[PDB]
Structure formats: structure tokens, C-alpha cells
Amino acid sequence: AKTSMVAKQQKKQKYAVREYTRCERCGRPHSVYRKFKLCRICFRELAYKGQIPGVRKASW
Template sequence: MARTALKAKQWKMYEKRFVKGQDLKKPTKYYNRCRLCGRCQSYIRDFGICRVCLRTYAREGLIMGLRKASW
């Protein structure tokens, strides 16, 4: 689970960048976070969530068209 301070910091940077229309001085400091748990590693851009949440949701059948592969 991500630290609350890091999630808050990233949210403030997101608001400054996209909502208010201002440029960040260091745009590389902004990084994507999972919408569900706040994790920054293993972020899957197509779904906007991390691999752990994606796997959980796929197993529960909550993501349409996605299922566990077996061969």
C-alpha cells in the first residue's frame, strides 16, 4: 500500500498540471498511480490500475473481455 503522503503529493501535482492548466517545473516528477490502491510500480496505462489490482479484478470477472490465460 502506498504511503498517504506520497498519494497526496502526487494528487496535488496532478491538480496543478491538468486541472488548473499550469506547467510543472519538473514534469518528470509526476508519475502514474493506481486509482484503487495508489501503487506506482507496475502501472498498466490501458486500465489505469496496477498489475495486482488488475489480476484481482480479472479473477473476479469485473473487467469485461479479460480473463486468466491458461495453456
């Protein structure tokens, strides 16, 4: 589990098919954006406080 698997992902692995993203706040593999490096929990938990520039909700 975590704190063993994240310190083997900040480590350049052999073949570059092998860079899975894995979020850089909490460590979660699992649903992770590239423009943010922030999974679906943390985008909503940070874009609510207001510390992610230019983001609001959408009501179109």
C-alpha cells in the same frame, strides 16, 4: 509512507518529467498499466471477479 505520498501525486508538480503514474486503487508505484491505471495485483484481483470488460485468460 502512503496516505502522504499519494496526496502529493494527485497534485500537479512543477516539471512534467515529474508525473509518475502510481496506481489509483491502492497506491502503488510500482508496476502500473496506462490503459487501466491498475498494477499487477489489482488487474488479477479484479479481472478474476469479472469487473474489467472483455478479459479472460489466454490459452493459445
